[PDB]
Every structure is written in structure tokens, then in C-alpha cells.
Amino acid sequence: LPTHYGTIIKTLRKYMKLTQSKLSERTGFSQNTISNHENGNRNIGVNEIEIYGKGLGIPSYILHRISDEFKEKGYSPTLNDFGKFDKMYSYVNKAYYNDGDIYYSSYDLYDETIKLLELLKESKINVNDIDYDYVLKLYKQILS
Amino acid sequence: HYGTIIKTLRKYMKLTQSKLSERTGFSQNTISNHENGNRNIGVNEIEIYGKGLGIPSYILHRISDEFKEKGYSPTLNDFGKFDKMYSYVNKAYYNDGDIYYSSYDLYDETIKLLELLKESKINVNDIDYDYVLKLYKQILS
Amino acid sequence: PTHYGTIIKTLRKYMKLTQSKLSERTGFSQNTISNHENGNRNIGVNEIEIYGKGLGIPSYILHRISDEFKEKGYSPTLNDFGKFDKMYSYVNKAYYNDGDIYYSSYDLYDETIKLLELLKESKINVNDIDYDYVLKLYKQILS
Amino acid sequence: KSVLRFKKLTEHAFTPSKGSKFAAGFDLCSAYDLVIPAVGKALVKTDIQVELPEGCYGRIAPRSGLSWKHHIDVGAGVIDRDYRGNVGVVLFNHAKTDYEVKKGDRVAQLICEKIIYPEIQEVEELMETER
Amino acid sequence: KSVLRFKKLTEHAFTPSKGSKFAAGFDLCSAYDLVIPAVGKALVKTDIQVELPEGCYGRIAPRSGLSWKHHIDVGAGVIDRDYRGNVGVVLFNHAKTDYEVKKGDRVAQLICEKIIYPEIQEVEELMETERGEGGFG
Amino acid sequence: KSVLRFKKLTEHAFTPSKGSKFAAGFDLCSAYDLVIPAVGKALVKTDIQVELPEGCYGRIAPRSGLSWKHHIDVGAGVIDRDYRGNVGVVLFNHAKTDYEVKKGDRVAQLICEKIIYPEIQEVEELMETERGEGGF
Numbered sequence A: 001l002p003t004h005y006g007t008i009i010k011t012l013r014k015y016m017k018l019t020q021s022k023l024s025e026r027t028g029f030s031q032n033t034i035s036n037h038e039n040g041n042r043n044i045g046v047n048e049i050e051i052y053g054k055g056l057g058i059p060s061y062i063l064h065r066i067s068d069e070f071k072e073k074g075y076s077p078t079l080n081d082f083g084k085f086d087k088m089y090s091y092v093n094k095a096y097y098n099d100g101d102i103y104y105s106s107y108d109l110y111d112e113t114i115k116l117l118e119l120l121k122e123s124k125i126n127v128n129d130i131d132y133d134y135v136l137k138l139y140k141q142i143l144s
Numbered sequence B: 001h002y003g004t005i006i007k008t009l010r011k012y013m014k015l016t017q018s019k020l021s022e023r024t025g026f027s028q029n030t031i032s033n034h035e036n037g038n039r040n041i042g043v044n045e046i047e048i049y050g051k052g053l054g055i056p057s058y059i060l061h062r063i064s065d066e067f068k069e070k071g072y073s074p075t076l077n078d079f080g081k082f083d084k085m086y087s088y089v090n091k092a093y094y095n096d097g098d099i100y101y102s103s104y105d106l107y108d109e110t111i112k113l114l115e116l117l118k119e120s121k122i123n124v125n126d127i128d129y130d131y132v133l134k135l136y137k138q139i140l141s
Numbered sequence C: 001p002t003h004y005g006t007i008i009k010t011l012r013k014y015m016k017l018t019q020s021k022l023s024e025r026t027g028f029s030q031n032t033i034s035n036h037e038n039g040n041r042n043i044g045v046n047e048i049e050i051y052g053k054g055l056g057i058p059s060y061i062l063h064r065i066s067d068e069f070k071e072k073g074y075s076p077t078l079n080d081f082g083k084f085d086k087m088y089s090y091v092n093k094a095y096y097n098d099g100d101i102y103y104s105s106y107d108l109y110d111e112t113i114k115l116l117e118l119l120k121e122s123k124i125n126v127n128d129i130d131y132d133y134v135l136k137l138y139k140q141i142l143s
Numbered sequence D: 001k002s003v004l005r006f007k008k009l010t011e012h013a014f015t016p017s018k019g020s021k022f023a024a025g026f027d028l029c030s031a032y033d034l035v036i037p038a039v040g041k042a043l044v045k046t047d048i049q050v051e052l053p054e055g056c057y058g059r060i061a062p063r064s065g066l067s068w069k070h071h072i073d074v075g076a077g078v079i080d081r082d083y084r085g086n087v088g089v090v091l092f093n094h095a096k097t098d099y100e101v102k103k104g105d106r107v108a109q110l111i112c113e114k115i116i117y118p119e120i121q122e123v124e125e126l127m128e129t130e131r
Numbered sequence E: 001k002s003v004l005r006f007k008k009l010t011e012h013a014f015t016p017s018k019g020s021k022f023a024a025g026f027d028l029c030s031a032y033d034l035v036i037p038a039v040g041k042a043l044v045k046t047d048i049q050v051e052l053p054e055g056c057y058g059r060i061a062p063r064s065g066l067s068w069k070h071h072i073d074v075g076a077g078v079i080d081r082d083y084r085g086n087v088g089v090v091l092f093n094h095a096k097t098d099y100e101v102k103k104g105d106r107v108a109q110l111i112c113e114k115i116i117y118p119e120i121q122e123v124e125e126l127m128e129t130e131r132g133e134g135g136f137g
Numbered sequence F: 001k002s003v004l005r006f007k008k009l010t011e012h013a014f015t016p017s018k019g020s021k022f023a024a025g026f027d028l029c030s031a032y033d034l035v036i037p038a039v040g041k042a043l044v045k046t047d048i049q050v051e052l053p054e055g056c057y058g059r060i061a062p063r064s065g066l067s068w069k070h071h072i073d074v075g076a077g078v079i080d081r082d083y084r085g086n087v088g089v090v091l092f093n094h095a096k097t098d099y100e101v102k103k104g105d106r107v108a109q110l111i112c113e114k115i116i117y118p119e120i121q122e123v124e125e126l127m128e129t130e131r132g133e134g135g136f
Ligand SMILES: [Ca+2]
Pocket: D073, D074, E073, E074, F073, F074
């Protein structure tokens, strides 16, 4: 199954309001190399996602998890709603590295970010309307 | 509190007001206000005092626990026997496997062991290391 | 200390080294080495490390050969060192490249011996056996 | 920089990852589904081989959440610098229940522990401490 | 020099201490009284947060006396450099009887283990070790 | 270079050894025959004392074959730089059967783990993980 890394990077580059040239100065890839990556002519290796992840400001493993969502579902709900994922992932990272109840009970910051988003959607509660302490209390309930 | 601790231990180890100053880096006025009680000693300074005096800082906290527990510190009142015996407990911990794999707290084991010599009236300079090592192994069952 | 002189003299000749070439590697004089090999001078534990580096053999294998001397009066491993050398290379490649050996091995020397005894039991020549076949026999000994 | 190189032995192997730059080790993911029996053990294969940077070895260290929440300890854990086989994670399930590991679960982390490779020298001194 | 910074989260926190300058780690004291059940586990809170010196991480290592005499093992033990939460000591009681941990008892020690923080790089080359196929020489 | 010094305390002590120069640790051999009881423990004596090279401590780490095949974990394992007593290997036998350790068996390995000997400093401020709270 295809990895769809070309569409993922082009979508995330536009989400970060970066031109192909500005990303080119961070990654070190040429503007033509970046264009061929986004279009699909040149394949993107596991070491190129690492370079793209640092250039975009996103941990590279989230780009792998988005590519895995494409293979399993045909689409990526995280990529479709990345703004809500970005804001929600900031809360779990602050909670993971500052709260012992999360550090000693967490399993996967990506997986727990999705379920945390799903539980706000379960209550149909909008992100960005939520507080950090409000999400932390719910974070500790999912982790017993 | 801690000011009284420092004055007794500084005099026990034969140090002047001046000799303490350049080991700590503290001025003599800071030290003088510390020892009588005008200026309180924050906990990052006791480690500096501990290295300047030559005693592990955690024993100075343990002496403070005796003050909180009894109003005075019997170990500080009898520091000469504690210092020499702590040399024996430290030697046994780092040289005998029966202590290294059974010790819990070098201070607590030094304190109780002194009480077993005081209970039976045996003098510190009168005891040898080899006999003290034998009594150490029973307390560590 | 129990036959170490014979070990060095035999292994030096097995590795096609002169007394001088070993002398130039170890730093020992040719006279010190000669007295070591004959039995006049006793070999301390720190010299086996020096001899091991000079011969190109891990010093602990020289200790294991000495244990056979203490146990039997002779060393069958030293008597057939050419086959041990070739078989020890196979166990080393398998130990560092296959997880089934890395997570089940106990001692590369003992396991080299067991493989040698199983080739002799089955009338198989060491110089003739392949590594991929040897790897399966190693995994059989390590259940 | 220092580089930790890896190679996927199968399709099921996962790329080791960190969440931040200051993570102690790279998370190791299980390449298969398996069950760790109660008061039992299991060898989780990652289907990767590693080449460690110089001056260190590879310590398979536990993950905090899995150890505390599921009573699981990591055994062995010493990966020599010259090991190029499948990296296996030895897991001890001390709980009274079986634990089910899923493909992609982070079962441990690989820490590049700086160590000394010294020469050994036998002494006849009885060495005594200096306290 | 290298500095290990810590802050007490409550009054119950203890200052980590060593017996000698070259002790491997700073002793970590339990901030509460608790019982680790037989063939069971417990997360011991130190009520401190730490900032580790550069070029290392914090390994919560066992103490020899408590491990050998009381059948206690230290689980987890990896303290990342950027972790600022409550430092917890995961203890596994493998004995058939409960163990009573008291406030202030040294349950483990924190070692600043020098490590490398490398970048990860995937190769297509099959890696293989030199030793073998040649032998001594 | 850096030297790991040891001394045999009895006739039964074994010289710690590696198979290659780049092995992580020196193999520690049991100096006596003993039994590690089922779901139990044992303190295996090596009958050696060690002096470690500078800038490190001695970690008694498990060996892969014995841990996986026999359900054995290494407890304690911290050897301070100034310890000159008999080096003991704490072994936990988690299996439901007794395990027999025999004289000469390699029960663990000694790794000279590079560590920092830092200063301890108490702060009053609540320390914050300072990196990523404003999003990617
Ligand atoms: Ca363990």
C-alpha cells in the first residue's frame, strides 16, 4: 500500500504557511526535489521524512502515523483536522513532561491525543474552547 | 538552629573563623551572623559548609533531626565518638560484602552501634575495628 | 601455572610466528619467551593477556585450554586447534548476527566444543561444512 | 553528529522514534502480536538491526507507563556494538494476568549508554578503601 | 561544573544525598509511608522534580541492601532530561510478604548516566559484523 | 589507557573476560555452586574485588542467554567506585523451578558505565519543561 507521503507533506507545508522555497532552506532539499516529492515522481524515504519533520516543526513519527491512517482507512482524520490535533497535542506534551500521573501511565502521545479528541467530539465539545487543566483531568481518567 | 550546629563542628575540627571563610567562600560576616542566629542558613549553604568542614551534609540534617526530636543533639554533644565510629562504619560498608549488601543508612547504623557500646560501657578509642565489624553484622541480621 | 608454557609455544607455532615476531608484539625478550615456553619461568595472569594480544587469540581461550590441562593432563582443544579456530569463527559470526544464538548462548567456547563433537559424531569435516548448515546445528544445541 | 543506523529486516519493523530532542532513548515497537503469559516471559522481536555510534553500547530500557501500569520488567537489555541480528526485547510479566502486545506497541527504548572499554589487569594487592 | 538541580514539591520531600563524593548516585527517599504488596508493585513518590546536567539522563537504580535483603526490584527508571513532574520510583516486591516503606527510607538512587543523543538514520544496506569468516590472526 | 583492576580473594575466583575487545562488559563467573530457589533470590559471590577506571561506576548487568532461557533478572547491580569488598551478583529466579548455578558459570557482566558526578542544588521555583506549548 502507498505511503502517501507526498500529499501529507504538501498539506502540512501549507498548514505551516511555508512556501516551497522557505522549506527548501530548512530541509536542504532543492525546490525541484521538494516539488517532485509532493507530486509523487520521486519516492520519499524514511530518512527524508525525518528531514521534512524537522523542517516543518513536527515530530517525524506523527508523519508516519498519518501515513498509516491512509493505509488503514483510505483517509487521514488527523490530517483533515490537523489544527485541532496540533492544539490538542500541545496539551498532552505539557502534561506528559510535567505531570507524574501521565509520565508513569502514558502509552502513546499520538494515540492518546486521538482518543482525547474523540472524547471531546463524543461530548461534541470544541477544542480551543477547552483549558489545559480541563484536558489534564480527562487525560488522567483515560489512564485510570 | 543550624547556626549552633556549625559552631560546635567547626570547633571540633580545629578551624578558625578565617580558615572557614576561603573554604566556603563565605565572608566572615556572613558566617558570624549564621552561627549566632541573625542570618538564617539556606539549604544550599549547608552543602557548602559540609564540604568546608569535611562532613557529609546529610549528617548535618540528621543532627537537625535530633534537635527537632529531642530539643538537643546527643550526637553533636558526643561527636568525637560518632566521627571515629563513622570511620569504622564507612570502612566496613566499602570493604565487607556483608555490610555493602545489607546496609540501609550509615548514620542510623552508626547511632545504634554507639548505643550498644554505651549500653555495655565500652570506650571508643578502646574498641578495635575488627570487633566493631563483628557487631555490625548482627544488627544487619 | 600448570602448562601455560606449552600453550604459548604450541599456539605461537600454530600462528606461524617466530619467537622474535612474538617478542616484537608482546614486548617480551626472546629469552623471556624461551624460558616461558620451556617451563623455567612461570607465566602470570597478566602475561597471558599480553601473549593473547600477541598471538591474536582471546586470552580467556588460553585459560580454558589450561583448565583442560588441569582436568586431563592434556588439552584436546589444543591438540585440534585448527578445527577449533575454524569453528570458533563460525560461532562468532552466528552469535553476533543471529538473534536465536545471541539470546540463547551461554559460552562461545563450550558451544564451539559441542559443535566440534557433533561433527565428529556425524563424520563431518570442519573445513568442509558450510556456515548456513553450521548455523542450524548451533540452533539445535541451543534448544 | 552521532548517528544510530538501523535496517528493517521485515515489512513489520517500525522506525524507532523520540517525541522530543531530549528523549533518553528511541522507542522500540513490537513487530508482531503476542501474549506475555502471567508470571511468565516473552522475547519481543523488533525486526530491526542496529549499528551504534562510537563510545557506547545499547541498553534496552523499559518504558515507564508499561512497567508501572502492567507490572512488566525488561530483562537482559545489553546490546553489544557488534550485534547485527534482530533486536529482541525480553519482557517479564510479573502480573497475575496475561498481557497482550499489539503490533506497533512501544515495548521498550534503546539508550546509547556511554561506557569505557578498559583493559583488565589482575592485582595481588588487597585493595582497601580510603575512608 | 555539572549541577543537578531539584525542587521539593511538598514539605515531605527529602534532599537527595550521598555518603561519599564518588558515590554512584544520590539516594532517593520515600516521601510517604506505604506498603508494597506481596508479589506486587508500588510507585514511590519522591515529591521532587529534577533538572539533569547536560549529556546524560537520570537512571533510577536499585540499592544493594534493599534489593538483596528484601527481594525488591526497581522498574522503569528512565528519567528524561526534560521531565519536570514528580519523580516516581517503581518498585516490584517479589517476596511473598508485604514490605513496609517508611517516609525517609532510601528506596533507590539517581545516577546521571552519560549517554549519546544521536540522530536516527535508516540504511538499506544489510549490516554484518566483521568477526568470523577468517578466525584468529 | 583505562584499566579495570581486580584481585582474586580465593582459589575459586575466575578472571573476568570478554570474547572481543568491544564487548560491553566483562563476564563474571560464580566462584561456588549454589541453588537459586524458585520465585526466589540468591547472592552469588565472585570472590573478586575491583577498582574501576575513572569517570564511571560498575553496573552488574544481566546476560541475554541466562535471562531469556531461565527467567532470571539481575537485582541491585550498582557497584560504587570505592567498593573493595567481594563483588556479589544478585540474581532473581522468577521461574517456578529451582535453578542450579555451578562454579564457573557466567551469571552476569560488569559494565563500566560512564556517569557524571554533579553538584546538587535546590531551587525554590517550580521548574517548567520549557519547549513545546505553543504548537508545531
Ligand atoms: Ca530489572
